[PDB]
């Protein structure tokens, strides 16, 4: 029914359009590549609704995000990540969602990395998957807000831990003990923890060993007070 | 069909605008499914309350907020008084809305307005802003509902693309 | 450089017209924005088919994480990659010039100016925060130096000592150094 | 030159009246009282307004002084200088023939949660009642008329004010009073 | 070359729906005034009126004017534009033929309140929590002699008598009475107070609350 | 200020900060060094201030030897009001037209969940300490004082007389 | 008022420590060493801290003085007023009963690239090691819990800090 | 459409632009019906007076304000002088244009441009800047002309 | 069939002039370059980059020639390195001018030193242009 008409949309409607966003949406590819925000979350929800409605065919999700923002710039909320995550979980039973991490996936995007359909969830070997320190760089409240503020931040931090255990099949106690400082996994460590299912090694590898930099000279003679030379590699 | 779908994830917004969107949802004669994702402050909470009863869903990690409007006044003494009457009447308007959307006593709702009150999914159901917690199976059912409602337009579009191709 | 150039039958923008031929012009210093656009473009171009992607670079510099993301996307795609240097390739642009087509597919225009330097960065906070950031940046220097050394064929220890300051090269010095492979001429 | 005038028990209140300006004047009046209790003080008011808090501070200082405190307005006395000028000793308030006297309510505002908005409206309404109550007493006019007049944005000549009960003498013998 | 005639809904139902939203509302004969009466809104509304009374066959299909603007005065009570933007809109809306239905979504203030009243009797709608308010006209700060300020006072008194005339015709009261009640001080109306005084006539048609629907279910 | 200073007058004027608190503390310590018996009087006119600076001023007032009589001129608001309420018993005066305000502490915070929770419970500590001291100074219980400080509590000087903040009025 | 105390051998280390203020305090301590090698020097502290360079300079000046140095805390001693509060003579460190004392680890500035960041991170590791060492020396506490508590900014009441070791007396016993 | 309908509502603009629109409207062969809605300030008053005489309409609620050219200028004494003389020549140009559009003498126009000058609908028609009150039937017919 | 480059550029960075010169030489069918009004350094390079025999200047046009510009910041050795590259840029620009004008490269370097203005006829004589419009 709708397969031939994805074809026909390609023939008449979705081939000509110029925008790279339009071409990507034609290829069922959703590139999350920017501090996730309110506008980004609404865009991703619209894209994912329409992509469901097209077909039960799969979706590709490339993630190069630095969290909700960088720590040196004003953060947004944690609710955009939860909104996108819930949309993805609702979608997944009717559409496979490969989720692939190119580059980086800091904190919130890490959730969006772990929210892909199990077994179809990958990160490049040269990526980093950060479960960063929790959270909220917004500091524009007063003391008249204290009575609410705790019941928010826990309310946010604990919500994330729960969702992360529903993606790594782990104990939320571990995730809580791991939040306290930003802990960023290698892809192999991530597969061990459960964040991703595979690691995408490149076809060809370039970087080799650098251990040939090691000195290996003898231990210093007991009668040689070393000078203060402070060198660089 | 023509039952409106509102997707709500909003951390703020003036209370009057939330009241406006609530009433707008109200005068639409068909239903109105409002699904809150992640958060809904005062304006977005008023939008959520305005959905058809039986179709105000809130996701597990969603946090609605009942509170009174935040304002600012500048003018003469009579201007100060008349504008504070603005704001108090708006508080009573919101209390009226929350009673006619939750069945809670307007006294208790006004107290909840006095100090900004956050609510999580279960408690948001408890007060009466939403009917169902949008867990994953609920979310699946919602995207199924979107499937069925959009599929009429989809079939129209099917036949048109058949003609054009 | 705005005017849409005619395509198979219609008027299409110059850069979109180029990407219709797999050619990816990178002309701005690599910030989060340009890097995301070029990563997206690379992924979609690899999606259409697998023939080859020529990157024409005029990059005068850029940030380290977005450039490494673009590099990893170039290496991830099935289709091979060739990088040409129209104008100049500085810093992370000179690192992208050593990111595509190791086997003799890096070109440069005759008066192109090439420069490599160790990646920069800046971050402060607690004491321990500075430890974590400094360790990460040293990891980044080492990774980009491994990539540079395996791209050009120079010793890793040589690259470390060379790139600590700015390093500038004429295309003849770049061929002799291994940075590029051929210099474009009138042919 | 202000040192010699302060020796002569003359205090100047000129320009906008503010918190620190008030504290300075309060101190001068207390010094003049504690030095000499039988010799009158003269306060000259050329001021376009002020803060209600600072104004009431100066007014309290003026009403504490054992030595009768005359006031002599020159140029402007706008809505807070005028009140203080009306708070000199009865029969010893003076003005220039062409000074301009204004009586008017204060401004204000509030923000955020409207709890503080209602509290600010209550405080602005207090200022209204407080000022008007004492204004009515010294102007010797019905409190209703004073409440109505303190609403209306308007200047008056010292002749109109002298009729209205605020000031009591015009320095110039009403020979240079121009409308 | 050929005169391209804009074809209207009876014969344009075969050309599909319009692409975006404002074209949709224009086709439905709804003129949504969501932004204060700036020269831009005036130009756009004049052009919409010119297009709507251009080729209506019956020109009895009413024109809807929904308001979400504080008129020609900014939120902090200082005029953001002049009273002539209102006149231009009002005049324009009069040179059409169709009955002019007006409604308020959230705020119809200070000029939009007059324009609200100025709809058809029996056909002025509001949302049940719309806030209506009438304030005296306000000029913006200009410098000069006593003569310039006197000229501005004369202009503002023409504007005040104009608004009082429209409000007298709408609310059915004495002209000077309407001047005293509404334009003399910035006064607020709930929907019920506004209905009591003739400002509005009805809620929007079909407005039915949610728990009311529930209890009729 | 010197003209007042030689009169053993210490001015707590304007919203308090750490610089104003440093100046007040230096004045008070010097004045205690000059004469440990003869009294210090101190005019209060302030809309607030940082809680720590007010606490510094309050402790400096407490442990020095001369009684620091506090006379309110104009206004005393929730941190200058606490300072005014802390003058020597029997020597907390008000001008007849001054107003007195009490309300809870204020301040912002930024950082991780841990750090801003720590800021939250230090604000709770400030609130507890201020309520305890106010209970010591007025005589009302923790509950009435906590209710009063909870919301903006504007008061007249006379009410403050029967509510304990002030000892008398200068109508004299 | 400050100078009239500077004849009574009192120094106000109030406000944030910066280059100019710390330079002023160092100069005053040189002067007070000059005036009398025996009479007590009292330093009143009220500060959210400042630079660790300037604070270490003040510390060096305080331990250069052949005279005794008393420290008193007014209100806030935070992250460098705490360090300089504990630096008084053993047995002569005081605070007001309602003063807050908060311990912390240093912070650094930013110039350049990854090699320069290496240089600055080595600086700040050295500074953290030195602060922990000296602080665990005059508090008579092991380095383990000093490293533990400095890394978490936690305000302390004077009795709590007195049990910790920063101060020797509370003025009033409260 | 052998007429060009020009709808006026504008609060100002440099007077040179009003002169340009006046000259253009007086240059084209085709007639012109200029309608004022709400206001017509300096340049708009020139554009309103510029239409075909007898078809310069103004609504009941319109105002027409005409003021002398206002300029600003910096520089040496001779430059100030020369720009001054030019601005006076512009004032005379505008006075003469109003004088020829309304048939009033240039000296009564110049007397009125001394200060900002507001005119109602009756005042504007009496003065001569417009010729007829705009009743609904007027641009009933105008729209019908554009349609016929 | 031949790129016809109309030039009127009061300025620009010299490196961009070099880049446009290289782009011009890259295509094989000749390039015509017609300068109007002004052709400053980054555009003087472009004007000299056209086909010898097909470079035209207009009677009113003036040609600017000058050495490159630059700002530097950093340690002493960074300043030394950056100075060395700006010198390399200036040497390259002199070489391009020598290729187009057939004049002593050292003389061209001497003329680059300060801002250098050429009328249309002096542009023809120097060698940057061939004919007058």
Curated annotation (Swiss-Prot), chain H:
It is found in: Plastid, Chloroplast stroma. Its main location: plastid. Keywords: Chloroplast, Hydrolase, Plastid, Protease, Serine protease. One of its GO terms (molecular function) is serine-type endopeptidase activity. The active site is at residues 42, 67. It comes from the Eukaryota. One of its GO terms (cellular component) is endopeptidase Clp complex. GO terms for biological process: protein quality control for misfolded or incompletely synthesized proteins. Component of the chloroplastic Clp protease core complex. Cleaves peptides in various proteins in a process that requires ATP hydrolysis. Has a chymotrypsin-like activity. Plays a major role in the degradation of misfolded proteins. Belongs to the peptidase S14 family. This gene contains one large insertion sequence (IS1) that divides the clpP gene into two sequence domains. The insertion sequence forms a continuous open reading frame with its upstream and downstream sequence domains. This is ATP-dependent Clp protease proteolytic subunit. It comes from Chlamydomonas reinhardtii (Chlamydomonas smithii).
From Swiss-Prot, chain I:
Disulfide bonds: none annotated. It is found in: Plastid, Chloroplast stroma. The active site is at residues 41, 66. Cleaves peptides in various proteins in a process that requires ATP hydrolysis. Has a chymotrypsin-like activity. Plays a major role in the degradation of misfolded proteins. Component of the chloroplastic Clp protease core complex. Belongs to the peptidase S14 family. This gene contains one large insertion sequence (IS1) that divides the clpP gene into two sequence domains. The insertion sequence forms a continuous open reading frame with its upstream and downstream sequence domains. This is ATP-dependent Clp protease proteolytic subunit. It comes from Chlamydomonas reinhardtii. The lineage of its organism: Eukaryota, Viridiplantae, Chlorophyta, core chlorophytes, Chlorophyceae. The gene is clpP.
